[model samples]
Target chain A: TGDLINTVRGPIPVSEAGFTLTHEHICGSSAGFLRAWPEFFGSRKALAEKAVRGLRHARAAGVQTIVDVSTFDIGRDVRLLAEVSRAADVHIVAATGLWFDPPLSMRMRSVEELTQFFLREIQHGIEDTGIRAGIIKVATTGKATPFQELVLKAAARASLATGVPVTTHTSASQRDGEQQAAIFESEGLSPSRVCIGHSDDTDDLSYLTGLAARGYLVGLDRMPYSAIGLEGNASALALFGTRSWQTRALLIKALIDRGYKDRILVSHDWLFGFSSYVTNIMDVMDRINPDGMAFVPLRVIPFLREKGVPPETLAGVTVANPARFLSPT
Target chain B: TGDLINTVRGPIPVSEAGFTLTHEHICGSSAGFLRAWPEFFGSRKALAEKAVRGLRHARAAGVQTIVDVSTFDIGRDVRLLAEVSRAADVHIVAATGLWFDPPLSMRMRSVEELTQFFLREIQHGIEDTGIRAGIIKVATTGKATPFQELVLKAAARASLATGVPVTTHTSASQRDGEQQAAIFESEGLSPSRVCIGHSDDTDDLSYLTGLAARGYLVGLDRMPYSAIGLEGNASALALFGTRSWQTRALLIKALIDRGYKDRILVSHDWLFGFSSYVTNIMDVMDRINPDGMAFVPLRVIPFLREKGVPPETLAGVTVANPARFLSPT
Candidate 1:
């Protein structure tokens, strides 16, 4: 939750991992934390401790790579995160972009300056410390606050520069997925390349199922089950059908539902600091909270299996979806 | 997080008297939270147990009143809350209103039906079990959710109905406060009687300052220590004037400078289920583990005193402000 956009050293190589957790957090913004203390995850130490532990657990959970979407003002601790990447044996893809607040009046080195700032990190490294980011992260919050819009513009330009796909963080409320999609579309970015996070918070089934139709990747991961069933289960269940699960199963049966599909992705937006075993978070996850299941995913999977969700649909959501989506186009 | 709105019986009165939290909750919805777990805090046993714990803490902290603005989905638990209110010995101010979601097409009742039902609850006791709401509640989400707009409309209409001033759960993001205010103004509700909650999440100082200029009671009460250093805090302090110990000092001074001496209010915006000694929860305030300095008037009062914040100014934010907006018209 600490700010780390300034810290992500880039030049991220391609990620062709098996089953990537595209919207996981290696680190996030804690910059304006004092302003919103608990929301921001104030301490870097606490966040890092969580990051190390969680990444390791994620690796064991069949997650080969984790995308870290830490945008501007949300500090980019690339060096520390890179080290965590190595330690956890997880391919950590970090990002760059600006959040919509603090005006960035003083710190904004202009989009041109920012573009180069990102270019250097992506091309070289964060001051040559050798740590770097994988994917390019961009975001908009609540109507793209003026500053947020500006950052989006810069991020779009940066994405063009790096050829790295863009992903955004929405308000995680109903239909906000549409809102996030609208921003990226307006930026002229192809929907296919961007990943919209938190599609599960809303009851708007059309909005999410529509994202798949529109080309962008939709992430419906959960953060410690705050509501909404398990991201994996929720997305699968919610998108199955409008009228009948069997009808939806027919639709899934119709589309390219197999082949390591990458249309949808799932991951936990875990906040390590919010937990007790901050540093030993991975160990705890292994023991107590593995897979971050919200509802009965195993049972849901079995039920869906019985409902005729070609096994590929499950594998697609579980693996192929992330890999195909994360593949370098 | 459950659908308590559908179950709301009528006017629910709550009275808790130690450190009247004014705005706090045990359950609310976040799109997914309700969809996943519809029966949130429904059983009085769980509700009462939490209320009793809250009461114990409030008693320990010397808090007298606890205003539960858990409107929307989890709002209609009047009977259950009444039971808890009696057991807790805490003056609980229950709120009534529509959450800014949508017209629940499935439900037999319309939004007006709900509001009118709430009004009757205020008029009569919940099913003859003597209880009545202390204040009316309303809301507006950041994106101008049409449903929230209607909720604000109902709050104004209900204020007219119950002769009770209305308090708003302004979108915590500060993205739609103006729209919420506009809705209030459109209904011809004087801003003076409305306390807009969570104006702190916005970075637009002029926007909020203009809001204060419009004569509304401004609420920034969610623990300042949290927003004291975040992006949200940046603009939040703009209205109040910087949040540094010096800024908080200077802002208090500036409030006097600006003659906004009586328009400010403060509170914890605490969700008891999350904030209570519950072992774990994901929230903005939890990371800092802020000392109880937030609820203690002494900590804030002295700082204000040092900053030349007049006692009257302190009272405005601490008491008079909330009272003026929350009191019956």
Candidate 2:
């Protein structure tokens, strides 16, 4: 059967390939300015050019797929994403969920309304783009901010409808992620099929290790970014990846030790829509000399290699894990 | 007995004296940056000119007091702080509290160990400079972060020991205040004695109102800075205050509503020793033009006036409240 997932293009092939960027984006961002100002989208033509080139470049660098997590509030341009996929042929997984609340109204909508919104997007094409949604994206910022609970209810129904594994854009600190996960479990959603994004922001290894111990996939791709800017952290993590890969290995090992090997994924969590940094969250921007790039991820690769991370383990986190998530449930 | 709080200087302080900028630094700030690159502390000359200017300006502004929260990890130059205080003729309130875990010791020792540190600072002058502290300052980055309990615990004991009312460098969110308050209550410290700093970050009226109701002093200072940024939310609150006097009134009403109107203080939480625009915190040095510098408590007065805030309210927030907290049991 054809993969039920859709992107900026039409249907995507089910095959998993090289270095699937579990979290990335060509367009879509959320930070008040972007919401109020459409001009922040940058020149669509220029963005398209950049997006196409960016995807091709990833392809050249041995990347096969990329999942964009930008939802409605942050700049979920399904049509534009479709265009990028069509133009680039990169396997693109788009998320279907609500963003932060206060300004958004996911809280007020009934479960039926929310499910309709999700089903419409997942079943039909997002915004009628003729593209299909492959997976469900959900999130709860902070301690289940008012809207988060409602979104969880809505997302559960949507996940049930589409059978798409759910993922979340949880807050970076405190009991945000665990509390959010509890909400999902209470709603009867399987944690095994959900990936909590940004769990790395908090240093509570036990908390993250516990999430991993659970069946849910964990995303640790947005480190350093929370400390510096995103691009800066990406660059740092990538650099650390190169140095004997122990840093990366230790992370994986720590999770494994905490009992979460199968449920972990690696990603840059890169979004082109974010204007904070001109380059990738890894700091691969136009400003840096190209020759210095591998200093980022390569550091961890060596570390992972030293830690006996088989080539398959690398592929699993960077590829299969996200791919499994991408498959239409 | 005099108030025994000690405020250290960081690396930058705004220009203006007489009125307490409330918070600032002078000739030292090595935590966030130096944690990543320890060598950054060696480059301390950046504050030479600004330090002198800050002290002179504060003295000129008729400012006679300031409370510096820069701790030892960030390089507590108590001698320089005392010198600056002496030069400026200001009563500097220095601090003694632990920072977050990882970058800094999760705890310097135990809560008792940390409290003893503050007690010593209170008992002794800042490195024999003889400029004694007038109050104790503590910091907590976020409410949900369990680590804060350690810092709050230490602060509570230090307050209980020295009879020095406690002021805090609260996290960016409004709810974090409750966490700090809970720590105080758990330790049997009176909420009336705590200066819950940075209540203006989250504009949720109910949040601040709720805190004010708790018989504690709410810090509506830092009028233009964000908890994450250096600019306080004072103006925005002041704007809110213009109609509802949401800024000043929220502080007043929260106290009044809680029947704790006796506890309220106004300050800029101004940083006088460090660069004005540090990353991740409000640093609106450039905007401190003819409109009034960010540190000027006067900028907040207009809003109080617009909101028809009585002189009594101002006294309660700016003077009487502080006096009560600083008062001996």
Candidate 3:
């Protein structure tokens, strides 16, 4: 019962980390051209305020904690999460793992080599920061290429070593969620320790049910925001059948009906400063998902009931499920 | 072990009704205007030839018996089924019930009145064609209007009366498959006696899973044709995410994996003569579903394996499931 969940603020008692969004990105920005051009892109201060604004709104909707799934490629800033937590008065858990496009040197490393890197961050903290990562964020595009396979196996081993759970990014449009599960299973990692993320990308239930059947958490973590691009096309955010928020809510109810209520994590895998180098995309996201961080609590939960999820089942997805998944065995 | 299954040709042993297609319209033409204009619409002989051609194709793919879910409103034409069974050398079971848009006078009938009518068809001949209806075909659009509820309860009572099982057409886009089950349950109708039809209308798995969970067989019966209207836009068949055949196959696998292997009925739900009164829709359908009745065995079954459905599970959906559902207790 004395289990402590590592957060940017401190290692908070896992009991206090209530109603967690197990897959979310807060206060992360692209580091190069986007970073230098704060006129075109968002400034650090501006982005932190946005994250703070979202977290505080989520607080009113009963969100007490969120796992920032951003890894190095996405420019995860622990300091931003730390201060944002103070400002918003909510727990913020950071992550450690390989990006889909990890550096070639990192990708070239053996499983044990890559495993040590992930272990170092979970155990000794990311970079020079003292705030430790509480989750591992692994990613893949399709059937894992050799490099992606290496990263998946490494993430599995790291989670096994430290008991830090693995959260994965998969193209749910493909049925590769199970392939991700297979790699983790091959590493002798329990399915309970991994969450198959971005699962709302497709309404392909076989891929989803199979993962949950094998005991992996299926992440219905994307709010359906059909953001219009400056190029006059729908963005990839709404690419694969997550065309409407109501559709995504029904996906949640489908899993719950299939008896996988405990194995679901709802969030918005949103980036604070996502832009196409042409337009500020935040205004478009605001139009569709005005609640932002509270998208799960404010919109989806209400629709979950409309889709016939009982009260306790909704509670389990937001609170009890995450509390159990994030806790070490 | 000795249950008898009714067929248009004769009452057959239920065990002999092997690999049945539970919901398909073999040879039914639109009456009145469409039927009077055989130049615009195919003649009775031409439609029958289409049915025979389709049934023979299905027979080669191991289809032994089929339940034509055509009723009075849709023009049952049991003589056609009786003869097509002879020509194709396959068993054909006919249906008796009100259509979704039943005659206003028929809708005005009481539940007892409608039950007697449906019961007569099961025991007697369908409008004196000397071929008894083997199954009761019921229908609903959404939450049952007063008339629809009466039809549902009547179908339930008739099944209870005649030991003829019920199959239904539901707007799977709406969550009304459950409401259909509710009305059947209210009439003390065993859920095992009802098969929820056109369930491929929406990729909403909750409705499908919930129906199967309550012991109602779900009809993954529509092959996603995505037929082009004479204008240009996609037709209603492709509406609500049944956009591709692969998606439908995955829907079958989803239920199978969710452990409803015994409660799934897969069919094409294809009609012998369907049109918009413009362009011959037959040509368009042939382009996409070239195998027609063989759509299940030839295409979907192969794709089902691609979706990770096992051979025994495949056999369950094709042969074992329909035989059990069509057979009375």
Candidate 4:
């Protein structure tokens, strides 16, 4: 029997999630940013309008669910997420976990205390929002530092105790997916309950396939971002020197050919609204690639179809994978 | 007519206050530290006990009132202050202000928005404590930066709205008290309602007298800290050079001789408890001045007496000036 997944509005059957964007953000910001210049974050009403506008666009494009991975430490704004979800009629799975930059209070807290903190948010609700988190999001960069390891272990413990699935942020350039999987496994978490994200930033099929082999769902997210420019001769390499849609697609196709279709998830990792950083580069993002959220559905899906990847395989990547990974079993 | 002054417990007639210590912190911390390392702040019970223990020492030494200047941006912890006040039977007047290191949220906020933020804390309560603030504490260091000027003006606005007086932090070496007085005065705040602090850090009697002439209460609050090593051969010169108790005492004597005693307020600027920085220097501070909170009464007052400063004049600095400065009228 599958356990009901928690969303901003409350619990829903996991199977109800269809064509879900497994990882995304309605809003994202640093605790430092929010604490320093909160007025820049604007009113919840202002942020909600921006969030709902993008979410409605996604909803119109047949996206039923969004796993909003912003944590409290990184300006989660559960209240705003709730407002946007209500306004857009989208299922947003809020996350319970600290960001890579945990606040000093969180940093000094013992692992047991941190685990309890996470469990309280999962078991009860985030603050007074009455909205429960369905998943835990933990992040690490490069090789796992001692602090990151402590956080990852706590995330695993919270996930095990609360039956919430765990998602991760990895520096794929550093190839830390295996490290994340190892820590979760050590905590007795099954690989199936973990999603190793940003795997698309690398073209090393061995590393990507290795994570899939361990029953970890790999994210080929950052789609539109991975695809550098929209219309012209911008090489993904020249654009960011990071991974491109061309390379991400190649990796996805290779994974599919190896019968690892069930172990893939896709999203834009798009931040539709909020953040001064977004505003700074938004003009360029708009000029280059206007349909940020639409990149996965409009661009990638069509690209995959032309490449002869079957419809059912696409469903596994976009629909069934998100549902299963988010489900508590 | 003397106005009623707000305290953590409730309001009392300003005249009831005696030997008040203005511009000090029971604790100080950044929002960043609290958010990241909350456990380091320890339990409220633990912190309150520490605060009460030190405050009891001050009260035992005849210190009747304390103006705790820890602001919302710097971990005001009014609930903790309330607990300490109740336990120690000392009237603690908590402040509503932002610190020198305003968070990014505060830095980006408009002056009007910040003014309202201060007003809310003054009018209502800080974070549901319902213990209203009696004073506004605004801080600046070195030359008055634009940001600091912005904060000072907003503090003046809040004081005008709430009838709670304003106190300030200044780089006495840079003679920013004049700068602060100028801002508050320009904002239409009367000099009687403002205490320009840390003036003891400088021996520039002219600057100190100038501020006093404008009706600003001058703070010789550093006391023992200004005095440096107590007793023979702990060169006040070798220690802080300019901010010695001898220099502060000499300046105080000059101000008294000039009949400016009513414009003077005295305190140790003692950090009795709390702060990671405090922890680092705790042993040094404890060895040199075990009774930090008692420095004014235990050491400074007697020293002033030996220097031939009369008792009534001492009362004017310790008792009368603080009462007048903090009074709403």
DockQ numbers for every candidate?
0.02, 0.01, 0.00, 0.12
When only the first chain is scored, the TM-scores of the models are: 0.68, 0.80, 0.92, 0.91
The DockQ score of candidate 3 comes to 0.00
lDDT of 2: 0.56
Give model 2's TM-score versus the native structure.
0.45
Query: Which candidate leads in TM-score?
Result: 4
> Model 1 interface RMSD, in angstroms?
21.0
- Which regions of candidate 1 fall more than 4 Å away from where they truly are? A1-329, B1-20, B29-54, B60-62, B79-88, B101-111, B125-130, B171-175, B224-253, B275-279, B282-287, B290-298
Ranking by DockQ: 4, 1, 2, 3
lDDT of 3 by residue, B94-149 (tens): 98887664533354467876787787678867654667888988888777889889
Q: Is candidate 2 or candidate 3 better by DockQ?
A: 2
- List, residue by residue over A210-302, the lDDT tens digit for candidate 3: 888889999988865553343354543433233677777788888888888888988887656653222435666666667888878888888
lDDT of 1 by residue, B106-200 (tens): 02233574566457546654334445665666666566665565566767777777666667766555556677778878988888877776655
User: Candidate 2's error at A253, in angstroms?
Assistant: 3.3
DockQ of candidate model 2:
0.01
- lDDT tens digits, residues A260-326, model 4? 9999988877775545242334445545457756667877888888999999888888988888898
**Poorly placed runs, candidate 3 (over 4 Å):** A31-40, A227-242, A275-278, B1-329
Docking class of 4: incorrect
TM-score of each: 0.42, 0.45, 0.48, 0.66
Model 1 DockQ reads 0.02
Runs of candidate 2 exceeding 4 Å displacement: A1-4, A28-42, A101-107, A223-249, A257-259, A275-299, B1-329
